[PDB]
Ligand binder design. Structure first.
Ligand SMILES: [Ca+2]
Ligand SMILES: [Ca+2]
Ligand SMILES: [Ca+2]
Ligand SMILES: [Ca+2]
Ligand SMILES: [Zn+2]
Ligand SMILES: [Zn+2]
Lengths: 723, 720
C-alpha cells in the first residue's frame, strides 16, 4: 500500500501548513503541537524535541507525501505535553457519552416513558460542594455515587427524573406542574412545516406581495406572558413565528415580511392564530454578508506562535497555568462551567471560585407593533446555548496560538453529541504587567499574560462570545461580545427624507433602505459562586466620599471612604455605581496588614455600546415583573444547591420571577456565610448603518480583582531574601 | 577582508538573532525586517523576498561571521518596505535637530537674550489648519515658511518668542506677565543640593531619626495656589520638597519621611520655609521592585511574527494602514500628536480628525495633612511628559511584533535630544471582526486587526501609557494605563489592629506595614479636534428613554430616543452618562439613509479602577476652581489656534482656570462650525496591598465610533 499526500491529509486533520522553499522546511501547527520538518529528514521537531521518523517526508514533483502513520506519529506524539491523562477522575467531570446513553436507558426502563419524550437537559448532578472541594484541595475521594439530572419533555409536559449511574437505578421522577419546556431543535422544523402546510398562511403571505412561499423562512420565538392580553391560553405549548423571504443572498434576515405573525401549537401541530397588520413591501435588495460580492483583501500574515508548546497543561478537564488551577466543563444550557478555582500562593492553593458560568441572558426589544411586542430572547434558558455552541473558526474566532477543546453533550433525543472546537483556550500578551522607569536608572518592566477561555454560541441571528480571562496577578475578567445579524423591521422609508421616516424610526434607527434596526437591550448575567479563601464570606461596601476637612490646613475637603457591611439578600440586590467598591471579603482571614482577604466585584468595567442603567421597560411591564435580574447590576444570594438561573429554571411563559427575584425574596443573612455573586451587565443597542448587514463584534467587560487578598504585588515572583 | 561577529554586531544594531539547528537557519528580526539566512548560502530572504548576498554568512568555531557591509546590505536593502522616504515633507513635521539648533540661535542673537535662559518648550508653530488640510488632501503646498514657538525661562521669567526659520528672523519677543514656568530638569538638581547644603534641614532630618542626611532623596513638587493660606508669595518661583530615605533597595519611594516639607525658592537658591509636623519613624524594610530579590518562573516563549513585513507604511511621520492615514508628531509637553487623520472610504479620503493628543492630566490627592494637601501632579503641564518619555522596552512594553520609533525634541538648554524607542507602533489581533454561524450553513468569520500607537512617559513615581487605537472599521480608541510606584504616607501602624490604624487610614489604605497609600484620582484629558467629514459640525444628543406605548397592543412601554442639538460651549461642557449617545455630526453631509455622518464620542468606555463621577474636591477648593476640566467628562469648544490645554497654558501656581474654563467662558455657538472635543476620563484610586511595592498596570478606555458615517459594515471590503 502506497503513502499519502502531505498537504492534503494535514488540512483534513486541521493543522496549519507552511512551506519555506528557501529553508526547505515545513512548519505544521495544531493546538499545542508546533512541528518543524524537512523533506527527506531523519527527525522532525515537536515543540523543540526530536522525533525519529522511520519514513522521512518526501518531495516528488513539488508534491509532498508522508506515511499513513505520520499524523499519529507526529501529533499524538507525547512530545506535545499540552494534554495529560487524568488519574483519578474529577467529581465534576461532565457526563460521558456512555454515562449519557446510560441515563437515557435508565429513564426508558421506567413505567411512564413514551417515544415522543424529548430530553431538554441531561446533566451531571454534582456532589455537594464540600466533598468536591475536599477532592480538589485534599484529594479526598467523593463517597456519593455519580447521579444525573434528566429533564424530559413529554409532549408539552416537563418531568424531572434523577438517575444513579453507579448503581444503574432511577431515583426520582416528578412532573413539574405549569412549567413549559424550552425550545428544542425539532421545534424549528415543525414550525417551518406547519407554516409550509398552511393554506391560510400561504394566502396571508400571497397578499403581502410574495409569490412562491417555498421561499419563506420562519424563525421560532417564545411568547412570554401577558396575563392573557395577548389572547393565548396559559397551558398550551406555543411559539410565535416571524417570517422572512429568501432571496438567495444567504441572508434572509435582510428581508422581513413585516406585520405578519403566526402562533403555533406544537402539540396540535398547527397554526392557532395569525396576527396581520399593515402590508409593508418586503425589502428585496441583496445583502449578503459572506463576501460573495466582495473583493478578498490580500493581508500580510501575522502569526502568534509558541514553538516550545504551552505554559498550561490540560489534564482531563483540569487546567493548570502559572498559579491558577481550575476545572472546565460544558452544560447544554449555559455552556462552559469554571469550577474549583484556586490560586497557588507560595505553596498553598487558596480557594477563589467554586463554580462560575453564565447564569442567563436576555435580549428584549422595545417596539410595540405585532411583530415585536413579545419579542425577547432568553438565549440560554429558552434555546439552550451550550447545545447551540458554534465551533471556533481557527485563527479568526480565536488567535492562531489557541488550543480548541471538543466538548460532549446530549442532544435533545438523548443521543451524545460531540461539539468540535467548542471552547478555545489561549494565552496572550496583554501589555506590561508593570513598569517603572526611575529617572537615570535601568528600566524595570515585565510582560502581562492573560489566559483566556473563550466560548461562542449562536442563537438564531445573533452570535455571542464569552471570554473568561485569568490574569497572572489574580484578577479574573469576564467579557461578553456580540456580533452576527440584527433583527430588523420592514418599513416603507428608503431615506430619512421619505414621509414615513419619523414613524418608521420611532423605535429604531433606519440602518438601510426599508430596514430599521429596532432598538433593544443585550443583558448578560453571571452567576459566580466565589468562595474567597473559604466558604464563609461577607459583602462589604466602600463608597468614596468627599468629606469636609476637619484637620486644619488650607484644604476644605478630603477624600474618605464610608465602609459598611451589607447584611442581607434584599440590600445586596442593587445598582452598581462604578465609583464605588463592592467587596466579597472573608471576615475570618486577613492579609499581612490585618485587612480582610477579599475580591473586588465590578459588574461594569466598560463596554463599546451605550450601557443600560437598568431595564428599559416601565415597572408595570410583564417582562419587567418576571425578570428582576434585568434591573440590578449586582446581586448576592445565600448558596443553595438548586438556585442557578437569573431568569428561573423554566422561564418560558413564566408568570412570576422564579430567578434572582425568587432567590433573594426570603431575604437571607449575608454575614459570614456562603455567598454567590450574580453580575448583570446590559447595554442599550441603538443601531447604525455601520452595523448592517453584519454587526462588528461589540464588547462589555466585567472584572474581579484581588483586594488585599495578597500581601504585595502578586507578580513580583518567588522570594529569595529570607521566607 | 574583514568579517564582524554576527551575534555581537547584530545585537548592537538592535536586532533579534535566533539560531535553529534543525534547519541550519538564522532568523533575524528588527522592526519591519524579517530576515532568514542559511550559513554559506549565496542568498537570503527579507520579508519573503530574495536577496543576493555579496558575502555568504560563515560559521566557524560554531560562531557566525558576516561581511562588515552585511547589516546595511540586508536591513537597508529596500526589501523592508516599512519605511519610505518622504520627498515632500508634511507641514506638521516637528522641528528637526537643525531647526532646533537654528531657532536657539535666532533668540540667542537678540539683545534681549539673558545669559542663563532656559527653554521650557521649543516647537513648530504650524501653518493654519486649512492649508495643512489642503496639503494632506490635495497635495497643495503650504505658502508659509517654517516658524517656531520658543518659550523661554529667564530665571523665573517666561518670554514667548516666535522665529522664522526659513528667513532666519525673529518675529516676536513677548514677556509673559505673571506666568510661572514649568519645572525644568535642573530644578531637580538644585532642590537636592539646596537641601543638602541646609543646616536647618539636616537638623530637622536628624530629629526624625535619620543618621546620614546624604541618604535623603528629595522630590520636587509644584505648590499650587491657595490665595495666601499656604503662606507663599505669588511672585517667587517656588517648589515644595517631599523627602525619602535611600536605604539601598533602589526604591526610595518606599521610605517616606512623613510630615517633613521644605519650601525652596529657586531664584534665591535656598529653603524659605520648613513645615514640620509630628514625627513618624521612616519605614525601613527593603521593598525593591526590580527583581534583585526574586526569581522569575520559567516561561515558554511567545512570538508575534510578521514574516512578510508590516501592513503599515511609515513615510517620514505619515503613517498609512488599510483605510487609515495619519501623521505622528512628538511634542515636548503633551507627547505624541495624531494629525490629519483621514479614512479612505472606497477611494475617497474623508476627514475624521484634524489633530488629537493628550491635552493634559492631573493626579491630585485626598489627604489634608502637611505633606499632602498641595500635592497635585499636572504631569504634562508641570513636568513635560514628552521630554520625560520612557523608551519602550522591546517586547515587554510593546509586543515582539512592534516597530519602535525614535523621536527628536529640544532639552531645556535648547540642545536637541533624540528619544530612542519613543513611540511603539504595532498591529494586533483583536478577536473576530464579525461572525455569523448561520445554522446548518458555512460559518462566516473575519479577524479584527487594530493598529496601536503606544507611548509611555514617566513622571517621578508614576508611569503612564497611552494607546491610540485605530480599528479597521473606523472606530478609534484611546486608552490610558498607569503603573509604577504609588506616593505613600509613613504611619505608625503595622497592621489594622494597631492604635493609630483608624486615624492612619482616614485618607488611604494600609498597603504595607507603616505605609498608607493615600487616595487620589488619575484624571486624563484628551483634546480631539475632530473634523467629522469636514470642518463644520454640530453636537447632537441622543438620550435613550422609556416612553408610554401609544401604538396599541399589550406593551405599556417603549424604547425611544430623545434627540436634540447642544448649541453652545456652555451646554456642551457636561457630565457623560454612558447610557446616552453624544455625536459630533456634520449637518451638511449624510449617508445613503439621509442620516448625517457623525462620530459617537464616548469619554467613558470603562476602566480597571473605580471611576470618578467628577472631581473629588469640594467646589470651593483651589485646585477645583483652577482645574475645571476635572469635573466634566465632555467639552466641545470652538476651534482657535491657541487653545490646547485643559489645565491652561501656564498652570504652575495659576490663580484662576486658564484652560477649558477660559475656552468655554465666552459661551460660543456650536451650530454648524469648527468644533474641538475634549474628553475627560478619571479614576478614584483607593490602594491595595496588591499594588505594592509596584502597581500592576491599570487601564481606562475611551472610544470614538463612526455613527452613520458609512453606509454599511465598513469592513466588508470593496464590491467586485
Ligand atoms: Ca461562595
Ligand atoms: Ca435566598
Ligand atoms: Ca474640528
Ligand atoms: Ca470659546
Ligand atoms: Zn443588538
Ligand atoms: Zn494612583
Amino acid at each position: 500500500a502506497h503513502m499519502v499526500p502531505m498537504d492534503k491529509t494535514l488540512k483534513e486533520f486541521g493543522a496549519d501548513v507552511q512551506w519555506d522553499d528557501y529553508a526547505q522546511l515545513f512548519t505544521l501547527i495544531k493546538d499545542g503541537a508546533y512541528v518543524k520538518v524537512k523533506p527527506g529528514a531523519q527527525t522532525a521537531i515537536v515543540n523543540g524535541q526530536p522525533l525519529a521518523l522511520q519514513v522521512p517526508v518526501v518531495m516528488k514533483d513539488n508534491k509532498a507525501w508522508v506515511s499513513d502513520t505520520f499524523i499519529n506519529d507526529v501529533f499524538q506524539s507525547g512530545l506535545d505535553q499540552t494534554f495529560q491523562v487524568e488519574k483519578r477522575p474529577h467529581p465534576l467531570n461532565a457526563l460521558t457519552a456512555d454515562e449519557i446513553k446510560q441515563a437515557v436507558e435508565i429513564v426508558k426502563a421506567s413505567a411512564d416513558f413514551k417515544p415522543n419524550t424529548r430530553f431538554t437537559e441531561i446533566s451531571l448532578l454534582p456532589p455537594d460542594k464540600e466533598a468536591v472541594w475536599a477532592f480538589a484541595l485534599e484529594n479526598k475521594p467523593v463517597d456519593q455515587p455519580r447521579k444525573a439530572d434528566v429533564i424530559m419533555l413529554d409532549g408539552k409536559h416537563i418531568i424531572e427524573a434523577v438517575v444513579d449511574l453507579q448503581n444503574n437505578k432511577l431515583l426520582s421522577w416528578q412532573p413539574i406542574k405549569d412549567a413549559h419546556g424550552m425550545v428544542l431543535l425539532d421545534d424549528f422544523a415543525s414550525v417551518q412545516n406547519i407554516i409550509n402546510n398552511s393554506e391560510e398562511f400561504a394566502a396571508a403571505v400571497k397578499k403581502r406581495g410574495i409569490t412562491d412561499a417555498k421561499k419563506v423562512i420562519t424563525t421560532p420565538l417564545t411568547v412570554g406572558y401577558f396575563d392573557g392580553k395577548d389572547g393565548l391560553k396559559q397551558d398550551a405549548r406555543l411559539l410565535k413565528v416571524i417570517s422572512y423571504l429568501d432571496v438567495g443572498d444567504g441572508n434572509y434576515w435582510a428581508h422581513p415580511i413585516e406585520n405578519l405573525v403566526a402562533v403555533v401549537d406544537l402539540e396540535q401541530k398547527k397554526i392557532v392564530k395569525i396576527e396581520e397588520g399593515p402590508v409593508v413591501p418586503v425589502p428585496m435588495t441583496a445583502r449578503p454578508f459572506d463576501g460573495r460580492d466582495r473583493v478578498a483583501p490580500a493581508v500580510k500574515p501575522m502569526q502568534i506562535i509558541e514553538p516550545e508548546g504551552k505554559n498550561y497543561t490540560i489534564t482531563g478537564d483540569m487546567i493548570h497555568w502559572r498559579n491558577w488551577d481550575f476545572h472546565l466543563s460544558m452544560n447544554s444550557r449555559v455552556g462552559p462551567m469554571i469550577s474549583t478555582v484556586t490560586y497557588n500562593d507560595n505553596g498553598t492553593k487558596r480557594k477563589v471560585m467554586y463554580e462560575g458560568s453564565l447564569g442567563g441572558m436576555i435580549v428584549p426589544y422595545g417596539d410595540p407593533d405585532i411583530g415585536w411586542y413579545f419579542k425577547a430572547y432568553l438565549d440560554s434558558g429558552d434555546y439552550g446555548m451550550g447545545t447551540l455552541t458554534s465551533p471556533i473558526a481557527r485563527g479568526k474566532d480565536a488567535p492562531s496560538n489557541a488550543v480548541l477543546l471538543n466538548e460532549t453533550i446530549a442532544d435533545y433525543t438523548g443521543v451524545p453529541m460531540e461539539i468540535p472546537r467548542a471552547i478555545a483556550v489561549f494565552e496572550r500578551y496583554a501589555g506590561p504587567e508593570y513598569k517603572h522607569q526611575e529617572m537615570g536608572q535601568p528600566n524595570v518592566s515585565t510582560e502581562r499574560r492573560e489566559l483566556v477561555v473563550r466560548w461562542i454560541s449562536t442563537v438564531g441571528n445573533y452570535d455571542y462570545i464569552f471570554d473568561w480571562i485569568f490574569h497572572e496577578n489574580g484578577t479574573i475578567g469576564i467579557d461578553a461580545g456580540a456580533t452576527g445579524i440584527e433583527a430588523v423591521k420592514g418599513v416603507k422609508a428608503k431615506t430619512m427624507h421619505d414621509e414615513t421616516a419619523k414613524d418608521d424610526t420611532r423605535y429604531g434607527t433606519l440602518i438601510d433602505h426599508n430596514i430599521v434596526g429596532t432598538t433593544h437591550q443585550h443583558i448578560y448575567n453571571f452567576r459566580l459562586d466565589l468562595d474567597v479563601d473559604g466558604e464563609n464570606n461577607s459583602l462589604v461596601a466602600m463608597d468614596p466620599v468627599v468629606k469636609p476637612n476637619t484637620a486644619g490646613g488650607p484644604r476644605t475637603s478630603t477624600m474618605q471612604v464610608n465602609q459598611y457591611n451589607i447584611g442581607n439578600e434584599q440590600d445586596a440586590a442593587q445598582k452598581f455605581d462604578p465609583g464605588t467598591i463592592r467587596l466579597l471579603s472573608n471576615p475570618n482571614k486577613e492579609n499581612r496588614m490585618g485587612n480582610p482577604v477579599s475580591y473586588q466585584i465590578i459588574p461594569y468595567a466598560g463596554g463599546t455600546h451605550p450601557v443600560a442603567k437598568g431595564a428599559q421597560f416601565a415597572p408595570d411591564e410583564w417582562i419587567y415583573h418576571r425578570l428582576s435580574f434585568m434591573d440590578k447590576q449586582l446581586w448576592v444570594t445565600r448558596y443553595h444547591p438548586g438556585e442557578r438561573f437569573p431568569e428561573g429554571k423554566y422561564p418560558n411563559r413564566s408568570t412570576h420571577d422564579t430567578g434572582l427575584g425568587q432567590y433573594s425574596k426570603d431575604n437571607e443573612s449575608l454575614d459570614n456565610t456562603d455567598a454567590v455573586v450574580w453580575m448583570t451587565t446590559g447595554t442599550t443597542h441603538v443601531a447604525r448603518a455601520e452595523e448592517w448587514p453584519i454587526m462588528p463584534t461589540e464588547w462589555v467587560h466585567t472584572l474581579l480583582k484581588p483586594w488585599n487578598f495578597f500581601d504585595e504585588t502578586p507578580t513580583l515572583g518567588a522570594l529569595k531574601k529570607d521566607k
